[PDB]
Amino acid sequence: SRILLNPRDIDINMVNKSCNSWSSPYQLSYAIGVGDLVATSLNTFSTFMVHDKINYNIDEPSSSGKTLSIAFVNQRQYRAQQCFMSIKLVDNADGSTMLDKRYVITNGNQLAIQNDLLESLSKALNQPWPQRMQETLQKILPHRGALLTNFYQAHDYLLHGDDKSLNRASELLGEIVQSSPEFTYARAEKALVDIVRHSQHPLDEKQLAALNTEIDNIVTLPELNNLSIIYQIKAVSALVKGKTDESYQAINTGIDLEMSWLNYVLLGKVYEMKGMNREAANAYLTAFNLRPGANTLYWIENGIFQTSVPYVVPYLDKFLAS
Amino acid sequence: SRILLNPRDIDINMVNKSCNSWSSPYQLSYAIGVGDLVATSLNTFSTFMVHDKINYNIDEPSSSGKTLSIAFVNQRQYRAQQCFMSIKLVDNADGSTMLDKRYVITNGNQLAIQNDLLESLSKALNQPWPQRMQETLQKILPHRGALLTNFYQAHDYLLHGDDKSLNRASELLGEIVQSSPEFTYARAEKALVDIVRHSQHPLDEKQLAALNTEIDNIVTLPELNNLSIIYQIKAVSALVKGKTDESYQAINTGIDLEMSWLNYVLLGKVYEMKGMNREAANAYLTAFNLRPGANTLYWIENGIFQTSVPYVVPYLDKFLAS
């Protein structure tokens, strides 16, 4: 009844949520963004498997050989002291600490910390980052620290997935794009947020129209060539139009480019449209393994169109009840 | 205390070992070779993770979402009837049978069955095989059915790893190479078997010499460009010479080309030579996850040079005792 630890399976955990008192955004959403970026980079570009558990409150038995912890700590030298972001990588087999970082976040060093994190993991894991990974990040990242904070706040609304969160994501990203129009990826994230909003409330129109200009623009920017996010947009657009084969093709390319909780949800969605519930539930369960918790659960149940977990994903319905 | 099934983790199981009575080789080693080929192809060329448990007698709790079973079955129409190789892929989450094949092996259809298996898995898993995978297989496979049977018998001796097994592997592969000199990969497998033998008994010489001609030849055959097996040979050769950096470099390229139990053992071996036991034990435990059982255990403890599992791999020593 021993469970064998798998040294190439990694959990990512978060603790001390809210240095002091309620949230408290800013630092939390930055850390959530970073952890999602580590997870997706590793799932996509290495033979490591990562469960991003940042949004998961539950301690369950895992065969994960390694655990990456993110914790906001204070030394305790005074009242309302400044936090540091403690990040540790532990080997659960041999007990050792593989990496132990203490980051002070400053309003300019957000990109630098994240880069340091990814270099450090590369070394601790003997995992070189591939050219495609390095070229994808130069395409998706802003250059100024504070734009990354802002981006990750909008991104965290996206993760949440509810109407109000998405409306907030959209408006934040419109701001970001206004202050830095070169930041193409922000436009792409805004376009994804906007198609998703519309997908769920398909009888609405702003000055019309609108969303179509945005989406028409975005799929033509040569800069966004060969990014998953453009395939996510194409998938959603084709599903809304009931062009299921085109949606299928699009999301499968997206998955080739990025192994993410969201791509597997979108694939589940397309499978339901194909009348293939068992393939759908399998995709949703893959999504849940990648990022377990209320955000992903929320997206399975609500994203694009509504989905009954009890009827369509019985394995997950039963798992969550147990 | 629920364990979440991971739909991209696959166990491969074997049953009915020995259609009838003792072994019984031929069909068994063919099936072992096929299962090792499925495992390594999937680990290497997809985001699936496979535990090849064909050589593992133990039932332990696994979060594997899917299980591939290989079983030798008889209908029971007469005495000493002919076996069929039953191969099923089951989804442990939703209970369903994803693939159910009944193969009759004939002395000519060995390549054809294996190909059919790999096409079928590709479809059942929605997993297209990449160009590098398809080009690697055309390079490593013979064309005549019976050569594959012979190859996999020698390969199975390799898996076993003991002196007598390797001597048998070597002689079988010398035969194979004599009857089909175009079958370059057989020469490579023979060269790998031969360096490994020599590594373990470094004070022996045949007509001298010998092994060096074989190894000198093999690393020059342009046909074997960009195959893991050449990097395995270079790794072993450099370790024997105490050229640790060169061995390190070689095995890490090998691992880029093929994610296999053996590459991770070889890497563990190089780590010990680097004075890095914790990195070694981590590599060995990766090897054990890839192919758990006595063969891999045997290679950890004996391959190239001797290694104490109790002192060098305490996590595994303790796991196996529990």
CATH number at residue B118: 3.40.50.11830
| φ, ψ at B241 (rounded to 5°) | -80, 0
Cα separation values, A86 from A105, B70, B320, Å: 11, 47, 35
* Residues B86 and B43 occupy one common structural domain: yes
C-alpha distance from A24 to closest chain B C-alpha (Å) = 31
- For B248, which residue in chain A has the nearest alpha carbon? A126
Structure tokens at B189: 């497998």
The neighbour count for residue A165, using CB atoms within 10 Å, is 18
* Residues A232 and A88 occupy one common structural domain: no
What whole-number distance in Å separates Cα of residue A126 and Cα of residue A86?
Answer: 22
**What 3-state class would DSSP assign to B307?**
coil
| φ, ψ at B18 (rounded to 5°) | 100, 70
Chain A residues lying within 8 Å of B3, measured CB to CB? 3, 60-62
Total domains, chain A = 2
Structure tokens at A149: 């904070």
Chain A residues lying within 8 Å of B2, measured CB to CB? 60-61, 319, 322
CB B53 within 8 A of CB B12: yes
Best interface-test mutation with B: which of A56, A57, A64, A315 has the largest number of B CBs within 10 A? A315
Of B134, B161, B188, the residue that ends a domain is B161
* Residues B76 and B152 occupy one common structural domain: yes
* Residues B32 and B125 occupy one common structural domain: yes
* Residues A170 and A272 occupy one common structural domain: yes
Spell out which chain A residues touch chain B, with contact meaning CB-CB distance below 8 angstroms: 1-9, 43-44, 47, 49, 60-63, 65, 91, 93-94, 96, 126, 252, 259, 278-279, 281-282, 285-286, 288-289, 292, 314-315, 319, 322
Alpha helices in B161-257 (DSSP H): 163-179, 184-200, 211-218, 228-240, 244-257
Q: What residue numbers bound the domain in which B188 lies?
A: 162-322
Query: Do B49 and A6 lie within an 8 Å CB cutoff?
Result: yes
* Residues B322 and B183 occupy one common structural domain: yes
Query: Do A7 and B286 lie within an 8 Å CB cutoff?
Result: yes
What whole-number distance in Å separates Cα of residue B38 and Cα of residue B42?
Answer: 6
What whole-number distance in Å separates Cα of residue A195 and Cα of residue A234?
Answer: 10
Query: Do B7 and A49 lie within an 8 Å CB cutoff?
Result: no
* Residues B39 and B110 occupy one common structural domain: yes
Count A/B contacts: CB-CB distance under 8 Å: 97
| φ, ψ at A90 (rounded to 5°) | -115, 140
> Given the structure tokens 């949004």, which residue do they identify?
A55
Cα separation values, B309 from A24, A140, A186, A282, B306, Å: 49, 45, 52, 39, 10
Q: Give the H/E segment covering residue B31.
A: helix B27-45
Query: Do B5 and A65 lie within an 8 Å CB cutoff?
Result: no
* Residues A232 and A104 occupy one common structural domain: no
Sheet of A97-103: strand order equals A49-52, A6-14, A64-73, A84-91, A97-103
Of B161, B190, B221, the residue that ends a domain is B161
Alpha helices in chain A (DSSP H): 27-45, 110-124, 131-140, 145-160, 163-179, 184-200, 211-218, 228-240, 244-257, 261-273, 277-290, 294-302, 309-312, 314-320
* Residues A148 and A186 occupy one common structural domain: no
What angle (nearest 5°) sits at the alpha carbon of residue B276, between those of residues A134 and B252? 40
CB B300 within 8 A of CB B312: no
* Residues A249 and A123 occupy one common structural domain: no
**What 3-state class would DSSP assign to B311?**
helix
* Residues A93 and A206 occupy one common structural domain: no
Of B119, B140, B161, the residue that ends a domain is B161
| φ, ψ at A84 (rounded to 5°) | -115, 145
- For B51, which residue in chain A has the nearest alpha carbon? A6
What whole-number distance in Å separates Cα of residue A239 and Cα of residue A232?
Answer: 11
**Which stretches of chain B are assigned E, i.e. beta strand?**
6-14, 49-52, 64-73, 84-91, 97-103
Cα separation values, B322 from A6, B239, B278, Å: 17, 34, 21
Query: Do A60 and B285 lie within an 8 Å CB cutoff?
Result: no
* Residues A269 and A229 occupy one common structural domain: yes
> Given the structure tokens 């190894």, which residue do they identify?
B215
The neighbour count for residue A227, using CB atoms within 10 Å, is 21
Beta bridge partners of B50: B10
CATH number of the structural domain spanning residue A205: 1.25.40.10
